[PDB]
Amino acid sequence: PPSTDEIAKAALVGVYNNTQDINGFKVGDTIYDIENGQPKGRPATEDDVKADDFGGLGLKEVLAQHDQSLADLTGTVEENSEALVKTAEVVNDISADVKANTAAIRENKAATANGLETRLADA
Amino acid sequence: PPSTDEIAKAALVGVYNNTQDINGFKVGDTIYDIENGQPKGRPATEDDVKADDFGGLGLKEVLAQHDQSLADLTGTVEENSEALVKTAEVVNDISADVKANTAAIRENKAATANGLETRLADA
Amino acid sequence: PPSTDEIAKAALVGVYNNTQDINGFKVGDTIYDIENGQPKGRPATEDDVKADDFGGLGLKEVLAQHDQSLADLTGTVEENSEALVKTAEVVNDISADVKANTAAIRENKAATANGLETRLADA
């Protein structure tokens, strides 16, 4: 069987490894495992750091980076939403002016006494 | 050296601390450390909660909040993408009408017997 | 009291559980607890997997999924930002053409000798 002493040491080493998973590690930090039922330390190299799923940052630090990313990205998305509204307002305005002008173009597309005397004269 | 008993107790306390990191803690939860090689508990105060990198939420809960944020933010981004397409369609439509009207404005910008008788008469 | 042996075993089991929280588990993985101060294993069923807050993925894997989501979503948001700029440029262009045409429509909306002789004749 494993003695109480071996169990205890394996638990302590396990705890250390989870603590590095949570809090991160860097070049030169001790990395521990169990060998001959004894804890054995060696220094983390840059290869160990690169082999870690998150480059040794630890879960807490990656989560903090995600908080910053989320807040920043939400800010850009908010700026884009407002730009969309402003653009839609302008476009509707332009849509009214193009129709008013169309109607104007349509509209502007408009294109005895004698016997007595004789007897006397005879004398 | 540290006895088996001290190793075991330090491992148990280490486990408890990682478990609080993962699952969170709140005011009044016991916080444990090792003193004189013995585990020692004290109550978490609001100062301890505030001093934690994630306010005592724990890694699981912060990750759940990130799941909700991601799903919500992706929904807004999806709404913005569709608004963009609808806006582009309308704008292209307007772009066709402004050119048709321009051409119309261009186009509408258009702006013996006698001797015998005598001898007789003599008589 | 709890013996050193019980403390050690409880620490080892605690470590295993945190390690599954961090790294994930799947159907058929051993799940351990403490019973009669002894560690006791049983196989994870699909019910256990479903009962886990993240379906047994583990914190590292959920964080990796969040990295992929963040990078992808940031890419869409970047595409939307550029589409917005291109749309705004086009709209401003159209806004200039609608005003030029308006002014054109306005402008095109334009709509003794005798006594001597007698004495002689008498002879």
XYZ file of C-alpha atoms in Angstrom:
369
model
C 0.000 0.000 0.000
C 0.888 3.690 -0.027
C 1.800 4.802 3.500
C 0.118 7.815 5.164
C 3.352 9.675 4.531
C 3.223 8.971 0.768
C -0.458 9.932 0.565
C 0.215 13.195 2.383
C 3.151 14.038 0.088
C 1.204 13.187 -3.028
C -1.615 15.437 -1.799
C 0.802 18.287 -1.080
C 2.348 17.988 -4.531
C -1.130 17.795 -6.117
C -2.171 20.964 -4.272
C 0.938 22.795 -5.508
C 0.186 21.852 -9.091
C -3.451 23.040 -8.890
C -2.252 26.223 -7.219
C 0.078 26.839 -10.206
C -2.817 26.091 -12.578
C -4.899 28.699 -10.800
C -2.294 31.382 -10.146
C 0.193 30.900 -12.934
C 3.908 30.185 -13.076
C 6.984 31.639 -14.697
C 10.476 30.723 -15.731
C 12.431 29.654 -12.704
C 9.439 28.719 -10.544
C 9.771 25.252 -9.012
C 7.727 22.559 -10.692
C 7.034 19.564 -8.365
C 6.168 15.947 -8.984
C 6.402 12.732 -7.038
C 9.324 10.354 -7.542
C 10.013 7.262 -5.440
C 7.034 8.484 -3.413
C 9.003 11.639 -2.580
C 8.253 15.176 -3.825
C 10.857 16.379 -6.328
C 11.284 19.927 -7.556
C 12.921 21.291 -10.693
C 12.976 24.770 -12.236
C 10.393 25.744 -14.843
C 12.128 26.468 -18.172
C 10.710 28.525 -20.997
C 9.776 25.168 -22.681
C 7.553 24.335 -19.666
C 5.966 27.720 -19.844
C 5.226 27.340 -23.572
C 3.884 23.780 -23.058
C 1.250 25.095 -20.596
C -2.198 25.543 -22.156
C -2.205 29.202 -21.243
C 1.486 29.895 -21.306
C 1.667 29.799 -17.496
C -0.683 32.745 -17.028
C -2.974 30.781 -14.726
C -6.758 30.681 -14.729
C -7.196 33.922 -12.711
C -5.100 35.990 -15.065
C -6.768 34.621 -18.211
C -10.145 35.410 -16.656
C -8.942 38.999 -15.924
C -7.900 39.359 -19.571
C -11.349 38.167 -20.624
C -12.957 40.800 -18.379
C -10.912 43.520 -20.115
C -11.651 42.078 -23.581
C -15.349 41.852 -22.849
C -15.628 45.401 -21.548
C -13.638 46.772 -24.539
C -15.471 44.795 -27.174
C -18.840 45.750 -25.662
C -17.748 49.381 -25.947
C -17.005 48.997 -29.682
C -20.266 47.191 -30.293
C -22.057 50.040 -28.445
C -20.298 52.602 -30.678
C -21.338 50.611 -33.757
C -24.978 50.453 -32.643
C -25.141 54.271 -32.308
C -23.409 54.735 -35.680
C -26.097 52.472 -37.163
C -28.927 54.531 -35.708
C -27.327 57.788 -36.879
C -26.767 56.283 -40.314
C -30.364 55.009 -40.488
C -31.718 58.439 -39.511
C -29.656 60.135 -42.197
C -30.681 57.515 -44.761
C -34.385 57.964 -44.024
C -33.907 61.725 -44.393
C -32.226 61.177 -47.739
C -35.019 58.785 -48.704
C -37.551 61.581 -48.163
C -35.524 64.052 -50.213
C -35.091 61.641 -53.129
C -38.865 61.133 -53.273
C -39.660 64.854 -53.021
C -37.233 65.540 -55.859
C -38.647 62.684 -57.923
C -42.104 64.256 -57.704
C -40.632 67.631 -58.637
C -38.888 66.166 -61.692
C -42.173 64.485 -62.610
C -44.039 67.773 -62.082
C -41.497 70.035 -63.809
C -41.648 67.686 -66.796
C -44.311 70.006 -68.196
C -43.683 70.620 -71.908
C -96.781 128.243 -123.603
C -94.495 130.862 -122.057
C -91.930 129.563 -124.549
C -94.306 129.799 -127.512
C -95.127 133.295 -126.303
C -91.406 134.184 -126.217
C -90.739 132.857 -129.723
C -93.496 135.029 -131.239
C -91.982 138.119 -129.594
C -88.401 137.464 -130.785
C -89.780 137.342 -134.367
C -90.212 141.147 -134.224
C 11.762 18.362 8.959
C 8.003 18.719 8.580
C 6.282 15.653 10.046
C 3.743 13.608 8.034
C 1.085 15.222 10.190
C 2.211 18.757 9.236
C 2.422 17.851 5.541
C -1.075 16.377 5.624
C -2.494 19.467 7.366
C -0.758 21.834 4.996
C -2.187 19.846 2.075
C -5.689 19.941 3.558
C -5.483 23.691 4.078
C -4.084 24.147 0.545
C -6.983 22.127 -0.886
C -9.509 24.276 0.997
C -7.991 27.447 -0.394
C -8.053 26.174 -4.008
C -11.615 24.998 -3.464
C -12.562 28.561 -2.394
C -10.723 29.931 -5.445
C -12.771 27.651 -7.659
C -16.165 27.861 -5.971
C -16.140 31.263 -4.352
C -16.557 32.511 -0.803
C -18.672 35.012 1.061
C -18.732 37.039 4.221
C -18.641 34.729 7.185
C -17.101 31.748 5.384
C -14.086 30.332 7.220
C -10.735 31.268 5.754
C -7.949 28.791 6.736
C -4.193 29.057 6.930
C -1.432 27.220 8.714
C 0.005 28.546 11.974
C 2.494 26.700 14.175
C 2.001 23.886 11.661
C -1.671 23.742 12.673
C -4.660 24.760 10.518
C -6.299 27.954 11.785
C -9.653 29.313 10.695
C -11.085 32.821 10.858
C -14.226 34.366 9.364
C -14.087 36.084 5.982
C -14.920 39.794 6.382
C -16.131 42.091 3.648
C -12.483 43.357 3.397
C -11.365 39.797 2.500
C -14.079 39.543 -0.064
C -13.082 42.865 -1.664
C -9.365 41.908 -1.600
C -10.099 38.787 -3.708
C -9.320 39.237 -7.411
C -12.887 38.426 -8.325
C -14.640 39.616 -5.224
C -15.028 36.038 -3.955
C -17.171 34.930 -6.887
C -14.882 32.009 -7.686
C -13.656 30.865 -11.080
C -16.822 28.863 -11.939
C -19.145 31.776 -11.365
C -16.999 34.246 -13.326
C -16.911 31.754 -16.194
C -20.754 31.482 -16.043
C -21.000 35.278 -16.243
C -18.722 35.217 -19.281
C -20.988 32.635 -20.942
C -23.984 34.954 -20.446
C -22.010 38.008 -21.634
C -20.772 36.188 -24.702
C -24.197 34.923 -25.718
C -25.757 38.398 -25.197
C -23.043 40.321 -26.969
C -23.110 37.876 -29.896
C -26.846 38.540 -30.144
C -26.288 42.317 -30.403
C -23.534 41.881 -32.952
C -25.905 39.626 -34.959
C -28.609 42.329 -34.812
C -26.068 44.915 -35.988
C -24.955 42.748 -38.917
C -28.562 42.444 -40.186
C -29.143 46.190 -39.718
C -26.031 46.751 -41.848
C -27.299 44.541 -44.654
C -30.733 46.197 -44.573
C -29.090 49.614 -44.556
C -26.790 48.669 -47.454
C -29.745 47.386 -49.496
C -31.669 50.598 -48.928
C -28.593 52.687 -49.745
C -27.994 50.870 -53.032
C -31.661 51.430 -53.901
C -31.270 55.118 -53.148
C -28.061 55.152 -55.187
C -30.016 53.916 -58.216
C -32.734 56.525 -57.746
C -30.253 59.394 -57.410
C -28.629 58.380 -60.704
C -31.946 57.962 -62.537
C -33.005 61.412 -61.359
C -29.645 62.903 -62.312
C -30.126 61.675 -65.879
C -33.661 63.065 -65.884
C -32.453 66.480 -64.701
C -29.776 66.332 -67.398
C -32.394 65.319 -69.985
C -35.104 67.772 -68.891
C -32.500 70.534 -69.123
C -33.747 71.100 -72.666
C -34.103 74.837 -73.340
C -67.091 108.983 -154.322
C -70.429 108.246 -152.651
C -69.685 111.376 -150.619
C -68.869 113.483 -153.680
C -72.072 112.141 -155.196
C -74.035 113.201 -152.086
C -72.586 116.722 -152.049
C -73.652 117.368 -155.663
C -77.217 116.310 -154.813
C -77.533 118.518 -151.700
C -76.605 121.513 -153.919
C -80.099 121.309 -155.481
C -10.155 13.694 16.284
C -9.328 12.923 12.661
C -6.071 10.953 12.494
C -3.151 12.068 10.279
C -4.126 9.236 7.968
C -7.707 10.544 7.592
C -6.499 14.114 7.030
C -4.067 12.952 4.358
C -6.766 10.914 2.580
C -9.263 13.737 2.729
C -6.627 16.055 1.246
C -5.835 13.583 -1.536
C -9.510 13.212 -2.397
C -9.966 17.010 -2.272
C -7.025 17.462 -4.656
C -8.518 14.939 -7.096
C -11.822 16.778 -7.123
C -10.194 20.181 -7.794
C -8.075 18.565 -10.490
C -11.289 17.318 -12.179
C -12.797 20.805 -11.812
C -9.777 22.256 -13.564
C -9.150 19.623 -16.226
C -12.562 18.145 -16.831
C -14.017 14.657 -16.604
C -15.963 12.282 -18.789
C -18.219 9.287 -18.598
C -16.388 6.452 -16.944
C -13.821 8.585 -15.109
C -13.584 7.724 -11.411
C -15.310 10.152 -9.090
C -13.903 10.018 -5.503
C -15.300 10.975 -2.134
C -14.582 10.080 1.453
C -16.631 7.431 3.250
C -15.871 6.056 6.712
C -12.776 8.256 6.452
C -11.655 6.177 3.461
C -11.487 7.342 -0.177
C -14.166 5.692 -2.319
C -14.331 5.738 -6.095
C -17.246 5.208 -8.462
C -17.606 5.706 -12.218
C -18.898 9.000 -13.593
C -22.210 8.428 -15.416
C -23.721 10.705 -18.014
C -25.982 12.070 -15.186
C -22.842 13.204 -13.294
C -21.504 14.821 -16.392
C -24.772 16.703 -16.999
C -24.983 17.752 -13.312
C -21.570 19.486 -13.578
C -21.816 23.258 -14.059
C -19.880 23.036 -17.288
C -20.830 19.569 -18.378
C -17.464 18.183 -17.233
C -15.447 20.310 -19.646
C -13.274 21.716 -16.869
C -12.177 25.302 -16.353
C -9.238 25.128 -18.823
C -11.369 23.926 -21.691
C -14.132 26.486 -21.088
C -11.477 29.204 -21.024
C -10.087 27.892 -24.372
C -13.590 28.071 -25.860
C -13.874 31.655 -24.637
C -10.564 32.509 -26.333
C -11.923 31.168 -29.643
C -15.275 32.949 -29.164
C -13.577 36.216 -28.329
C -11.241 36.126 -31.313
C -14.127 35.215 -33.684
C -16.563 37.758 -32.340
C -13.899 40.486 -32.448
C -13.384 39.603 -36.110
C -17.102 40.081 -36.880
C -17.228 43.337 -34.968
C -14.158 44.494 -36.962
C -15.928 43.580 -40.228
C -19.007 45.513 -39.084
C -16.959 48.606 -38.213
C -15.452 48.717 -41.738
C -18.881 48.158 -43.325
C -20.105 51.139 -41.287
C -17.319 53.392 -42.522
C -17.871 52.303 -46.135
C -21.603 52.841 -45.732
C -21.071 56.284 -44.165
C -18.744 57.314 -47.008
C -21.277 56.243 -49.612
C -24.085 57.988 -47.723
C -22.175 61.271 -47.530
C -21.514 60.998 -51.272
C -25.210 60.461 -51.880
C -25.973 63.375 -49.561
C -23.880 65.650 -51.791
C -25.594 64.423 -54.950
C -29.091 64.901 -53.523
C -28.248 68.515 -52.659
C -26.656 69.250 -56.044
C -29.741 67.865 -57.769
C -32.052 69.815 -55.472
C -30.346 73.048 -56.522
C -30.608 72.006 -60.166
C -34.337 71.301 -59.826
C -34.695 74.680 -58.117
C -32.664 76.335 -60.893
C -34.302 74.513 -63.819
C -37.672 75.569 -62.406
C -37.441 78.577 -64.714
C -40.801 79.174 -66.416
C -54.278 146.925 -129.981
C -52.769 144.310 -132.296
C -56.184 142.650 -132.047
C -58.084 145.850 -132.842
C -55.686 146.302 -135.741
C -56.451 142.761 -136.979
C -60.224 143.224 -136.778
C -60.115 146.356 -138.968
C -58.143 144.448 -141.617
C -60.489 141.423 -141.728
C -63.356 143.869 -142.468
C -61.945 144.296 -146.005
